[PDB]
Structure 1
Amino acid sequence: VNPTVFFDIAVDGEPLGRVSFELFADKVPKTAENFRALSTGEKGFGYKGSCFHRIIPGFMCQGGDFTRHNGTGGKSIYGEKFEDENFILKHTGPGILSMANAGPNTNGSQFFICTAKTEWLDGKHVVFGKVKEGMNIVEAMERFGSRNGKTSKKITIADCGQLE
């Protein structure tokens, strides 16, 4: 009833496992359709084959930059950027899926998964989903990042698509 999508994660090519995310289209529909369409790839472009470029252990895993692969690109299904839809949902704990951005109303395609409650980001980043299964795979990816976010291994979304 809320869509579910999955990413299959690979570390330098070696399969790691699958993470599935429930997307709260009931509360943040524009934001959640944007992540759903990029996971299926149905508009022509999307997340398949891209990497997690910034992983800061004990905080969050960030990816979604499918154009420049380092945090300087990405785009939404609506344009380069779109507005912050609302701030109903908050960063209550691990598994929260929230949009990364560069300031007010600059959402594109980059997202991050919280591995901690990060209440200081409330009202600054739009929360739109959470880990349904595979939290242990997010924990395992977290072991490859560092204090400044550089990764030891290339963490890529080998495959991704919808499940519900």
Structure 2
Amino acid sequence: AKGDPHVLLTTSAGNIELELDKQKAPVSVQNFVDYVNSGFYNNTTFHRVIPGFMIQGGGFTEQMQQKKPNPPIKNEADNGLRNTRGTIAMARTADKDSATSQFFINVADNAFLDHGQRDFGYAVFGKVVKGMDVADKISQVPTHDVGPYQNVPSKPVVILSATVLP
């Protein structure tokens, strides 16, 4: 949510500004900023976009090659932050402590993703402060299947740069 560092994602579809919650999600925020500061997210894509749900990125190139990330981090989904529209959270696999570089932006209120009695859920670590219209736009682009992935934009939506703002 409202934490401290701001990050600008400049995409081929427009700009999205993030505010990261360093107080509630210290490990997730540090992890994310290290990826941005190292240039990791430059030329990755939003490889999975689902209208009325979310858009996910930070892992693959245009050619759907997967970049090699750093080691996985502990899940901070029990920090009280919820997966409401306009928040950013960490994607992961089956194990709760499996998140690496991939993140998603909620374009709707997705409470079934929240930490709860049935599942540990997905860690929220910031919010979109500018450019939700862009996030909406990206979620609505034509998609198709590539390899084992569905909902891949037919025309790649590229993160051309990601930078921590002063």
**TM-score, length of structure 1 as denominator length:** 0.83
| Cα distance between partner residues in 2 of 1:67 and 1:75 | 13
Among 133, 137, 140, which residue is 1:143 paired with? Answer: 140
Percent identity at matched positions? 32
The 3 A distance-change label for structure 1 pair 109 and 145 is farther
Q: Cα–Cα, structure 1 residues 107 and 145, in superposed 2: closer, same or farther, change >3 Å?
A: farther
Show CA shifts across 1:21-67 (max 9, x none).
000011111101111121222xxx51011111000111000001047
Counterpart in the other structure of 1:87: 78
Asked if residue 110 in structure 1 is aligned to residue 108 in structure 2, the reply is no
Q: Is it true that 1:54 corresponds to 2:38 in the alignment?
A: no
Residues 114 and 86 of structure 1, relative CA distance in 2, 3 Å threshold? closer
- Relative distance call for 1:125 and 1:100 in structure 2 (3 A) is same
Equivalence map 1:15-30=2 (5 Å) = 16-30=13-27
Paired residues of 1:39 and 1:160 also in contact (CA < 8 A): yes
Q: Unaligned regions of 5+ residues in structure 2, if any?
A: 116-120, 145-149
Match of 1:128, SS state, is strand
The C-alpha deviation readout for 1:74-129, integer Å capped at 9, x for no partner, is 523xx2x122134221112x111000000221010000000000000111100001
C-alpha RMSD over aligned residues: 2.2
Structure 1 residue ranges without an equivalent (≥5):
11-15
Give distance in 1, aligned partners of 2:65 and 2:105. 15
Q: Separation in 1 of the partners of 2:11 and 2:161?
A: 7
What stretches of structure 1 move > 6 A for 4+ residues in a row? none
Partners in 1 of 2:105 and 2:151 — Cα distance?
13
